[PDB]
Amino acid sequence: FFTNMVDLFNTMVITNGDEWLKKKGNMILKLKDMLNLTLKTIKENSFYIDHLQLNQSIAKFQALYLRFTELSERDQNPLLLDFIDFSFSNGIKASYSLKKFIFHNIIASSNKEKQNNFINDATLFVLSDKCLDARIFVLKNVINSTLIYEVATSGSLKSYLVEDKKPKWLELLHNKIWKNSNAILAYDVLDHHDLFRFELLQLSAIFIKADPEIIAEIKKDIIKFCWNFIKLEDTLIKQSAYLVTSYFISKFDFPIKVVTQVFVALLRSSHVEARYLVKQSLDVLTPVLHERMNAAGTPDTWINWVKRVMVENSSSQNNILYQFLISHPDLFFNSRDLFISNIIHHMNKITFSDSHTLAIDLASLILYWENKTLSLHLREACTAFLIRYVCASELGLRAINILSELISDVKLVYFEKFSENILYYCMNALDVLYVFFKNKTKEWIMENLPTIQNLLEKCIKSDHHDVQEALQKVLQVIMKAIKAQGVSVIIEEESPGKTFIQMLTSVITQDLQETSSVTAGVTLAWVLFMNFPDNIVPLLTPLMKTFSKLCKDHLSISQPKDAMALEEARITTKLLEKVLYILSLKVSLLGDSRRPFLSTVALLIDHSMDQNFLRKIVNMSRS
Amino acid sequence: MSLTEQIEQFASRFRDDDATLQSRYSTLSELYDIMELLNSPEDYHFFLQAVIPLLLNQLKEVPISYDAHSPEQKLRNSMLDIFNRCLMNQTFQPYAMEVLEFLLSVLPKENEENGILCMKVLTTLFKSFKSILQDKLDSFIRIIIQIYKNTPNLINQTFLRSSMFSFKILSECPITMVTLYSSYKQLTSTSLPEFTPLIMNLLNTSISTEIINRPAYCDFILAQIKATSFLAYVFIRGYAPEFLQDYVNFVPDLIIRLLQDCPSELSSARKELLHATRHILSTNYKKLFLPKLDYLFDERILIGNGFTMHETLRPLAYSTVADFIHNIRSELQLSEIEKTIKIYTGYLLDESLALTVQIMSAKLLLNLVERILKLGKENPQEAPRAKKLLMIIIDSYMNRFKTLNRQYDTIMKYYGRYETHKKEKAEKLKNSIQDNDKESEEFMRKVLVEMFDIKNYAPILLLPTPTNDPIKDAFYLYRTLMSFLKTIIHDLKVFNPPPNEYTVANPKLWASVSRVFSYEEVIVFKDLFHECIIGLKFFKDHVSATKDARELMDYLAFMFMQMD
């Protein structure tokens, strides 16, 4: 019967352009009593509840009710009457059907001023106990939504109040704010939704954060209202109250004693559920606490409080909040030094999980102090931590960059212990790239040449049956190590290493049976050819031999264009082919090896190749 | 300073604290100024043999007088948290003989900081026992038994803080459990005040507050309830080594009671209370008699007391209740199935909580469709009443899609940020130290609407704004719910009316595809097709379509093939 009455009235309003009542609104109230009576009938007699057609009928009824409400001259009472209508039951909001009408209610700049009147009887709906807590929570939604909409996409309270002209609800808010005494009768009167006190806290935060200078006679009531919330026992309400009182004492009206009290209450006993609240609270409170603590010279105890609480809950999880307390502002620091040993020990204890991104931001703090200057054991402590972290495995590259800048401001061979062995080899190679580059910075890498020679002997002979990344990433540190201004004035110390690496290229180019031995010779011959004009000129014919093998297995990858799997191991052969081109080409002192080399070059021009190195060989023919 | 060099830092302060009012930095702050954090692999014993006589002579004095506001309580708590910070590998008995004499003195008294060493010093002796066995297992465990015997005197004197978390579990337990059974039963199955039965005369239902102003102190109930939640957490471990006996039907009423009278002024205890509840419900035989004695009706939003901390305990409690409801799946008749889909569709359409809980609720309704089909196949008389249930849950799926589509452009705004916060976070990666693409050319060429957004501008944010991919969450929701919809719409084929009224020449084509629906079911199907066609705007470029949009178009096409 309810569905029949609803779609009969919906048909009668659809067949006309506007309301058949011509915005009278007497059958719609009859439909409202119809809905209340069928809800009471379905609640008393338990036959068949919560249907499809009941929900669709209620949706159609809300559609026609809110269609009539946007088509009237008194829109202020029947909206709140509709909020009364589903006090007992029937959802919490018509999602994007009632809230869309309220988003129409929030007109920009209140030109018509109907919304100001709505806010007036809205807060009269809030203070009067004419409904349960859920519809007063929807009243929170509409009131705080239009307030922060005027705050956000306009000036912060610049259109409603200009010279205390028409406040018209702020005195009702004074009457509301004055009742907070005796815990706003929270204990005396039982309210089971705690959204009401959070509504009031957020409403005060709107007034504090929006414009605390045009209003001056309300501020004692504001601070006593936001201070009565401190003495509760819950956690999120307590930290929201801490956040709003730090908003106020960061804005203006600064006291002397209790700002240290709310500071030490902020940085003590904060568990997991309120981390973002204390982050915002400290980030708002501390830049004015620094400038109002240093108004007198000798008070600097607000670093001593952080030190006392940091050594209080030592080596625990709650210290991490203080560990990135000192990281988000940094210019209020580089005035203490026990902080440095504290954070070094903390990152060395927290590296062994998922909080590694914390510890790097600890280390990125330390360098920011060092560049602020422009101890001793802690230097080798933090460099040992950095080396152990980068060889333990984005942010590792940040660790690389910070160690590279930190060395120039352990210094012994530790990498003899470095499956995952190839990954440790690559990370060791990335470490020794710069840790050999950043010491003895006058091209003075010759004293440790036997030690680093025995260190790298187990990875210059790497690619015999394993991956290419070891040689492809040790190539850079070999390219740094084999530039030592040559051997013409110094003793023959780099020269046995040169003869050793050239006989290694020789003995790895005698192996031509698989596609693993051909990479080591061409890579190390290329770094010898780049870093020295002299190379194995009596032994250039194995380079021609491997070049011909590269041509004859380019014949194997000629009739396919690409590989189905293992695609990298063809374009890396093309890459070392571009290497071997220039390597066997830039010296024209060949003997009988010129004509087969040129016939292979002509065969390379013959068959279908890629253009990016055909242009290289026509530039080479231009040379 | 990781050696004996600390001793000359307090060799002048090696004497005891005389005039303890102003001497707050002499002897007690040795683990507080600098000498608390330095490395000590085997560097402790160079001074650890000086800490034990010094702290021993500290603990010889400073008696049990607790009422005065710290003439001596400061150094008492100082040596207390010195005792937790020290980690040792040797000389365990010099620690152990000098700590028991204070915990054997504070058995019946717990008011005004009266003996709060115990919840730390018994844990430190537990830690030293877990380092290496000291064959002292029948001496220290009697004190908590005398605490349990003191609790009748404690409840008669109030017309607490046991903290039994690791006090009875030692991970081996080669002892008896009958004394543990009696010490649990002496306080579990009792009315904890003498007033909780007389508040059940107003039960017609539930109590939001703990007590309506019957006890004047109002802090004993808070501590006693906290201790009861501690013990209700800790007897779960006992179940796995040995089966518990002498009572099996006494846990559900105390579970419902403790869920009803948790205080709204705290939220920590509800976490391990729900953890103990799911640790009960993770078993095989304990989860059978529990749904009968709660009647699946005290498992509602009474478990959130105070609506400013029933926003972090939502996914835990909803996941445990849904996991248990999926675990039984055979005890449920149709009325409980109606009652649980009526609340879990509301959990699905609730926008205030996370996406994973909504996906879990949709998964729960998909797990219930088999029980609905089997119950409808049992008795055909309620076979229409089952079929309408299958038009409720998929209706909520149609609503959930709708709740996404109205946010469409708003989602796009965050996607714009998800471009820039990605685009500035991948071009900081090309600053690597790698080569063979630069030194090669160096060597060569040298010789040649704000509607949903209003929540994000509140001054009390209480949670950081997310930076996850909104389109990935939208595709996850659409793919999961459309697979569920394909399953349920195919499963609706068993509730066809008999084809003798339509008297078709081929009933073998019937009961496979062709069926009937009401008006309010084909309206739901029309809105489902409408919302699924609208929802393909999230997966445009931002017979030429993307892969995820093509997959969802295959789901939408296959979903409507088995409809009549």
- Asked whether the CA dihedral A23, A26, A29, A30 is positive or negative, the reply is negative
Taking alpha carbons only, the member of A239, A220, A231 closest to residue A184 is A231
Q: Do B38 and A342 touch (CB under 8 A)?
A: no
Q: Do B459 and A205 touch (CB under 8 A)?
A: yes
How far is residue A505's CA from residue A524's CA, in Å, rounded to a whole number?
Answer: 7
Per the structure block, which two tokens stand in for A461?
Answer: 């002979």
3-state secondary structure of B390: helix
Per the structure block, which two tokens stand in for A591?
Answer: 């003997």
How far is residue A244's CA from residue A270's CA, in Å, rounded to a whole number?
Answer: 17
Nearest CA in chain A to B78: A312
Question: Widest CA span of chain A, in angstroms?
Answer: 111
3-state secondary structure of A123: helix
How far is residue B433's CA from residue B279's CA, in Å, rounded to a whole number?
Answer: 51
A619 in reach of chain B (CB within 8 A): yes
Residue B456 DSSP label: G
Taking alpha carbons only, the member of A13, A114, A22 closest to residue A60 is A13
A530 in reach of chain B (CB within 8 A): yes
* Contacts of A571 by beta carbon, 8 Å cutoff, 6+ apart: none
Residue with structure tokens 């101890």?
A: A375
Q: B481, B362 in Cβ contact below 8 A? A: yes
How far is residue A123's CA from residue A199's CA, in Å, rounded to a whole number?
Answer: 12
- In what helix (H) or strand (E) does residue A432 lie, and over which residues does it extend? helix A421-437
Count of positions (residues) in chain A: 623
What residues of B are in contact with residue A247 (Cβ under 8 Å)?
459
Per the structure block, which two tokens stand in for A29?
Answer: 């109230």
Cα Rg, chain A, nearest whole Å: 39
Backbone angles phi, psi at B522, to 5 degrees: -75, -25
How far is residue B246's CA from residue A426's CA, in Å, rounded to a whole number?
Answer: 63
Q: Which residue among B32, B307, B451 sits closest to A103, beta carbon to beta carbon?
A: B451
State the helix-helix crossing angle for A219-228 and A195-210, rounded to 10 degrees. 140
3-state secondary structure A356-373: HHHHHHHHHHHHHHHHHH
Q: Phi-psi region for residue B217, left (φ > 0), alpha (ψ -120 to 50) or beta?
A: alpha
How far is residue A451's CA from residue A436's CA, in Å, rounded to a whole number?
Answer: 12
Residue with structure tokens 């959204």?
A: A195
Q: Which of residues 12-71 of A touch B (CB under 8 A)?
A: 50-53, 55-56
Q: Do B454 and A149 touch (CB under 8 A)?
A: yes
Half-sphere exposure (CA, 13 Å, Cβ side) for B178?
2
One-letter amino acid of A76 = Q
* Contacts of B360 by beta carbon, 8 Å cutoff, 6+ apart: B318, B319, B322
Residue with structure tokens 């990875």?
A: A459
* Contacts of B159 by beta carbon, 8 Å cutoff, 6+ apart: B194
Per the structure block, which two tokens stand in for A426?
Answer: 């690559």
Q: A202, B459 in Cβ contact below 8 A? A: yes
A144 in reach of chain B (CB within 8 A): yes
Q: Which CA distances in Å does A291 have to A286, B213, B460?
A: 9, 48, 25
Per the structure block, which two tokens stand in for B382?
Answer: 């309620």
Q: Do A195 and B307 touch (CB under 8 A)?
A: yes
Question: Widest CA span of chain B, in angstroms?
Answer: 109
Taking alpha carbons only, the member of B279, B284, B367, B374 closest to residue B322 is B367
Angle at A592 between CA A590 and CA A594, to 5 degrees: 55
Q: Do A194 and B307 touch (CB under 8 A)?
A: yes
Strand partners, B510: B514
Using CB atoms within 10 Å of the CB of residue A547, give its burial: 0 to 12 exposed, 13 to 18 middle, 19+ buried: buried
Q: How was this structure determined?
A: cryo-EM
Exposed e or buried b per residue across B7-17, where buried means at least 16 C-beta atoms within 10 angstroms of its C-beta: beebeebeeeb
Residue A445 DSSP label: T
Taking alpha carbons only, the member of B306, B308, B305 closest to residue A201 is B308
Per the structure block, which two tokens stand in for A499?
Answer: 């003869």
Say how many Å lie between the first and final Cα of chain A, rounded. 96
User: Read out DSSP for B350-373?
Assistant: -SSS-HHHHHHHHHHHHHHHHHHH
One-letter amino acid of A561 = K
Residue with structure tokens 């003590």?
A: A268
Q: Do A240 and B462 touch (CB under 8 A)?
A: yes
Angle at A191 between CA A188 and CA A197, to 5 degrees: 100
Taking alpha carbons only, the member of B121, B132, B119, B128 closest to residue B165 is B119
Nearest CA in chain A to B519: A53
3-state secondary structure of B426: coil
Per the structure block, which two tokens stand in for A43?
Answer: 């609640």
Backbone angles phi, psi at A174, to 5 degrees: -65, -45
How far is residue A582's CA from residue A484's CA, in Å, rounded to a whole number?
Answer: 24
Listed as own residue / partner, the contacts of A342-348 with beta carbons closer than 8 Å and 24 or more positions apart are A342/A310, A342/A311, A342/B37, A344/A378, A344/A381, A344/A382, A344/A385, A345/B37, A345/B38, A345/B39, A346/A315, A346/A319, A347/A382, A347/A385, A348/A381, A348/A385
Per the structure block, which two tokens stand in for B376?
Answer: 């409808």
Residue B197 DSSP label: G
Taking alpha carbons only, the member of A17, A90, A88 closest to residue A57 is A90
Q: Do B460 and A243 touch (CB under 8 A)?
A: yes
Backbone angles phi, psi at B514, to 5 degrees: -70, 125
Per the structure block, which two tokens stand in for B73?
Answer: 């309580």
How far is residue A319's CA from residue A324's CA, in Å, rounded to a whole number?
Answer: 9
* Contacts of A129 by beta carbon, 8 Å cutoff, 6+ apart: none
One-letter amino acid of A431 = D
Q: Which residue among A56, A235, A237 sits closest to B520, beta carbon to beta carbon?
A: A56
3-state secondary structure of B514: strand
Using CB atoms within 10 Å of the CB of residue B249, give its burial: 0 to 12 exposed, 13 to 18 middle, 19+ buried: exposed
Residue with structure tokens 């959802």?
A: A91
How far is residue A82's CA from residue A85's CA, in Å, rounded to a whole number?
Answer: 5
Residue B4 DSSP label: G
Residue A169 DSSP label: S
Q: Do B37 and A314 touch (CB under 8 A)?
A: yes
Per the structure block, which two tokens stand in for A407?
Answer: 């060395």
Listed as own residue / partner, the contacts of B367-372 with beta carbons closer than 8 Å and 24 or more positions apart are B367/B326, B367/B329, B368/B326, B368/B329, B368/B337, B368/B340, B368/B341, B368/B393, B369/B393, B369/B487, B369/B488, B369/B491, B370/B329, B371/B329, B371/B330, B371/B332, B371/B337, B372/B334, B372/B337
Q: Which CA distances in Å does A338 have to A219, A316, B24, B301?
A: 41, 18, 21, 50
How far is residue B524's CA from residue B526's CA, in Å, rounded to a whole number?
Answer: 5
How far is residue B26's CA from residue B75's CA, in Å, rounded to a whole number?
Answer: 11
Per the structure block, which two tokens stand in for B403?
Answer: 């709740």
- In what helix (H) or strand (E) does residue A39 lie, and over which residues does it extend? helix A27-44
Per the structure block, which two tokens stand in for A260?
Answer: 């240290």
Strand partners, A335: none
* Contacts of A171 by beta carbon, 8 Å cutoff, 6+ apart: none
Backbone angles phi, psi at B510, to 5 degrees: -70, 165
- In what helix (H) or strand (E) does residue A262 lie, and over which residues does it extend? helix A258-266
3-state secondary structure of B510: strand
Q: B513, B564 in Cβ contact below 8 A? A: yes
Where do the H-state alpha helices sit in A76-233?
A: 76-85, 99-105, 114-127, 133-152, 170-178, 195-210, 219-228
Q: Which CA distances in Å does A49 have to A159, A298, A398, B384, B400?
A: 49, 73, 62, 15, 22
Q: B276, B269 in Cβ contact below 8 A? A: no
Q: Which of residues 103-142 of A touch B (CB under 8 A)?
A: 103
3-state secondary structure of B322: helix
How far is residue B30's CA from residue B165's CA, in Å, rounded to a whole number?
Answer: 30
Residue with structure tokens 């996404």?
A: B404
Strand partners, B213: none
Other CB atoms within 10 Å distance of the CB of residue B76:
21
Chain B closest CA to A168's CA: distance in Å? Answer: 23
Listed as own residue / partner, the contacts of A252-258 with beta carbons closer than 8 Å and 24 or more positions apart are A252/A212, A252/A213, A253/A219, A253/A223, A254/A288, A254/A292
One-letter amino acid of B227 = A
How far is residue B487's CA from residue B481's CA, in Å, rounded to a whole number?
Answer: 10
